[model samples]
Target: EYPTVSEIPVGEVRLYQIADGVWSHIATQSFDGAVYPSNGLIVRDGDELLLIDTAWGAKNTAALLAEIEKQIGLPVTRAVSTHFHDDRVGGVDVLRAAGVATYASPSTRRLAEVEGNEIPTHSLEGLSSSGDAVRFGPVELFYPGAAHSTDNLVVYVPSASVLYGGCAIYELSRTSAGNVADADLAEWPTSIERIQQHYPEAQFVIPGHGLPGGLDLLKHTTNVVKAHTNR
Candidate 1:
């Protein structure tokens, strides 16, 4: 019997010189009209695995975890929520059930508590200068601050210079109109500037959606936001 999972290889581990990693098991076909298709990232350092955001529900989340287990025989050490949006953090309970420590900003936790029905049940860890690293195997969490959402945080892999912009940042052309209502539109530019300042040498930029890109993507987004706010 074939397993009911869709596995699309978005990138190459060796060709892209990727460390052990896998994207979501659910592809674009599984997306409901209500939410954009969400994907997860897995990074294997040695004996540990680190999971980025979880998808919409337990089913998809479990499938992603299963796929990851098939690829690498390691338990998830930590899970990071790029933002409090349901498409991103809805599977927190799934990861928590598997004993993964969930990390997010204090603001994210507060938002989740107020809107927990929209998220998942897990202990939220606040992001600060001291707790900057989200190491499971080799992955690192960098807080770029509010952009798409007030609680959004960017994850960076220092070794690869690949910055996971999360929802806080995204590629320019594929910008979605359905941004969170609580998003800090005014501070978006400053947040992006902070990201650029922190990782000027970042080679690959992976947003919450769309194809991964470079620093020029940031500039494009900044310009668009500025133009929209001014109008």
Candidate 2:
């Protein structure tokens, strides 16, 4: 079960606690007459904070930052965009303007620039192309492989055993893979398997959209990907 403690509204987004010092910043966007809610991570490490991904856009991200300062009173020193998609990197520009050091995989940087989206300021370097884990304060980033998107990534907090699966893993409620324009059907299942193997201790799995679940979410995502890819 999810250990969500509190929920607070901050302008266009909602902040909720996933663990003692870990929170998920959720932002919503309306597309094709449907409202899509996306989840990002906010990890408190000592006196500073690390943001896993930006909110929906600049405005939402800015609001989230402000609310964090007002509520948590900790400055977000760094941020990492899990992928190049707008849902993950949309607020990168805001982080850059705020002097928050931002990080992303090299593929994310290239794709965002090519696609005309705001890109992260710093590259995750070695970990972007490889499965090697890179530490960033209390959390670690892993590039399992291409799944939902070519540059899709996952963040794991060892202390909390929470895995921020981003768009790579599907929530249990999702009956279909929502979007696949940038997905690699053949490699997605393999990527999910890697995530499962790498983070076996992850008890809390947070999806890019929808609620957080346990390890079952990872299995559900593999099932969803195979279903979409095979049939």
Candidate 3:
């Protein structure tokens, strides 16, 4: 895993190129006069874009889609929601309205039902029931257990040797585990371990926020989860 955190801004689209086939798009969002970056992962499979997640909302998603199509020359055909969070799956409604098929775990679907948010059009079956990870195109996303969010998932890109940890793991530069309000601190550590045991070949890792890094990101997440487990 090389140091792949490259920040190149194109009209509010913060891009990170991890490899030739793999990239991440982060859109700048403002709240109360402060700015922040919300991440969404992308993988170019031939001419089509296989999206792991999308921008924080319609505003950001519109900008992101422009930049993505301009660069890749292909529209996103399908996407997988890492969870039901606004940042992870917020663009689902936008894409679905445009005929893009979106998939997620049943936990995420149920939450969206009560919240009245537009949910995924397809369901991601459990590992126990189907022994299959949620997939869209060539990307595979696995839910080891609860971590950052109860329905959070980690995506694996076989072509790029990368793992998209979503919010379950933070970037190595982060000092905190982020908003643990929806997190399962007790089960977090083992969730990461299970990902390692299963997808040990991933050379590069991308977190929900912050830059991409190597295996050190795992150490950062483990320490943060342990520190908060007893809190």
Q: What's the lDDT for all of these models?
A: 0.63, 0.86, 0.75
* Residue 119 error, candidate 3, Å: 1.1
Tell me which residue pairs clash in candidate 2.
none
Model 3, range 1-231, lDDT digits (tens) per residue?
222224423235755678887888877655567555667788887778878777777766767777787876677888877877778777677888777788878888877677676688888776422124755567877878888877787888888898889888788777755678878888788788888787888898888877777877877899977876655
Candidate 2: list runs displaced more than 4 Å.
1-11
Prediction RMSDs, each to the true structure? 5.4, 2.6, 3.1
Candidate 3 has an lDDT of 0.75
Model 1 CA RMSD to the hidden true structure, in angstroms = 5.4
Candidate 1's C-alpha runs over 4 A off are 1-35, 118-137
Which candidate number would show the highest lDDT if scored against the true structure? 2
Model 2's number of clashes is 0
Q: In candidate 1, what residue range of length 10 has the lowest lDDT sum?
A: 9-18
Model 1 lDDT at residue 81 = 75
What value does the lDDT take at residue 17 in candidate 1? 22
